[PDB]
């Protein structure tokens, strides 16, 4: 084990920045993930042949959708790598192992439709899982892939460690259900402003990981303006396809899903940054101060959407 993963000089420097873009070459994203696992966790965390097989099976179970795709999985994992590297003392061995995997797997088999669409559509998954429908499916896909021959990347753990890391992965994946994030964030806010927040308490760790998962999931709003602006076209391409499908069920979609309301997108982004993204990163900065650059870049993007609304660009 004296073959080590390296990146070209510009990726080696810029991968440490919260606002790194992983680029348009798909065939380099497996290498970037392994590199992040090797520096984040260690070169000994995983057997390379099992990890490589796991990564390729995960890639094959993401779909060709505009936003919730393979590129989003790796991007979310990289934001988690940055949080882990800038808070290295706060996490256990199992948390480092589970969290990069949770992030790579968190939207497995996404079709670009919300839990709401699956309910209104009466999709079979909505019968199997009444709440966090898609997020329960993604976890179930993660478990199927882990049960494929040659894919048990946790084979060096004891039974009880394996079980714990799969419980970290399950809870991290359920927490990417944005309907759960409002509650979780309000609870961490109270806990922080009263001084009861305690990282030796497992239920509090769970809440902090939950919040890290939302931060990583939304991290597209924390890139430099030209990345953030281009990735918004991709999320809206999904939203408008879901609103089309709502219209096909005879249901008026919510405004952000109506492609006839395309001109109100800038006002939509403000609403989202003020109600969801800014509070999300403010709280995360309060709990993990070295994540400040996520909040900063999010503020800068909010500032850019305000410039668009006043016709300055
Ligand atoms: O824009 C987003 N949502 C949204 C638009 C209007 N209202 N609104 C909203 C309000 C309340 C609740 C939920 N969504 C958005 N949503 C999400 C996850 C699906 C929720 C992830 C990223 C997103 N944006 C984005 C922007 N720039 C670059 N990449 C991504
Ligand atoms: Cl879609
Ligand atoms: Mg999701
Ligand atoms: Zn996601």
From Swiss-Prot:
Tissue specificity: Abundant in the putamen and caudate nucleus regions of brain and testis, moderately expressed in the thyroid gland, pituitary gland, thalamus and cerebellum.
Amino acids binding a divalent metal cation 1: 72, 106-107, 217
Ligand binding (a divalent metal cation 2): 107
Record-annotated active site: 68
Binding-site residues for 3',5'-cyclic GMP, renumbered to this chain: 68, 269
Coiled-coil residue spans: none
PDEase domain location: 1-312
Subcellular location: Cytoplasm, Cytosol
Positions bound to 3',5'-cyclic AMP: 68, 269
Medical condition linked: Dyskinesia, limb and orofacial, infantile-onset: An autosomal recessive, early-onset hyperkinetic movement disorder characterized by axial hypotonia, dyskinesia of the limbs and trunk, orofacial dyskinesia, drooling, and dysarthria. The severity of the hyperkinesis is variable. Striatal degeneration, autosomal dominant 2: An autosomal dominant disorder characterized by striatal degeneration and dysfunction of basal ganglia, resulting in hyperkinesis.
Family: Belongs to the cyclic nucleotide phosphodiesterase family.
Protein role: Plays a role in signal transduction by regulating the intracellular concentration of cyclic nucleotides. Can hydrolyze both cAMP and cGMP, but has higher affinity for cAMP and is more efficient with cAMP as substrate. May play a critical role in regulating cAMP and cGMP levels in the striatum, a region of the brain that contributes to the control of movement and cognition.
Description of how the protein assembles with itself and partners: Homodimer.
Record remark on domains: The tandem GAF domains bind cAMP, and regulate enzyme activity. The binding of cAMP stimulates enzyme activity. Composed of a C-terminal catalytic domain containing two divalent metal sites and an N-terminal regulatory domain which contains one cyclic nucleotide-binding region.
Name this protein carries in UniProt: cAMP and cAMP-inhibited cGMP 3',5'-cyclic phosphodiesterase 10A
Organism per entry: Homo sapiens
Name of the gene: PDE10A
């Amino acid at each position: 084990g004296l073959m080590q993963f390296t990146l070209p000089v510009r990726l080696c420097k810029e991968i440490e920045l919260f606002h790194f873009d992983i680029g348009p070459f798909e065939n380099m994203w497996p290498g970037i993930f392994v590199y992040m696992v090797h520096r984040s966790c260690g070169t000994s965390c995983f057997e390379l042949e099992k990890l490589c097989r796991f990564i390729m099976s995960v890639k094959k179970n993401y779909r060709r959708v505009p936003y919730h795709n393979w590129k989003h999985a790796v991007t979310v994992a990289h934001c988690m790598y940055a949080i882990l590297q800038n808070n290295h003392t706060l996490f256990t061995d199992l948390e480092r192992k589970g969290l990069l995997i949770a992030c790579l797997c968190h939207d497995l088999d996404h079709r670009g439709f919300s839990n709401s669409y699956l309910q209104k559509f009466d999709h079979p998954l909505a019968a199997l899982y009444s709440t966090s429908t898609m997020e329960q499916h993604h976890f179930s896909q993660t478990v199927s892939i882990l049960q494929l021959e040659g894919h048990n990347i946790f084979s060096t753990l004891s039974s009880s460690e394996y079980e714990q890391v799969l419980e970290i992965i399950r809870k991290a994946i359920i927490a990417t259900d944005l309907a759960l994030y409002f509650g979780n964030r309000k609870q961490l806010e109270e806990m922080y402003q009263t001084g009861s927040l305690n990282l030796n308490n497992q239920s509090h760790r769970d809440r902090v990981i939950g919040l890290m998962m939302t931060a990583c999931d939304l991290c597209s709003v924390t890139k430099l303006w030209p990345v953030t602006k281009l990735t918004a076209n991709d999320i809206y391409a999904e939203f408008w396809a879901e609103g089309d499908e709502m219209k096909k069920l005879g249901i008026q979609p919510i405004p952000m899903m109506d492609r006839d309301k395309k001109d109100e997108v800038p006002q939509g982004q403000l609403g989202f940054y003020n109600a969801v993204a800014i509070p999300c990163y403010t709280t995360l900065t309060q709990i993990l101060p070295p994540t400040e650059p996520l909040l900063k870049a999010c503020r800068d993007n909010l500032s850019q959407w305000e410039k668009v609304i006043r016709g300055e660009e």
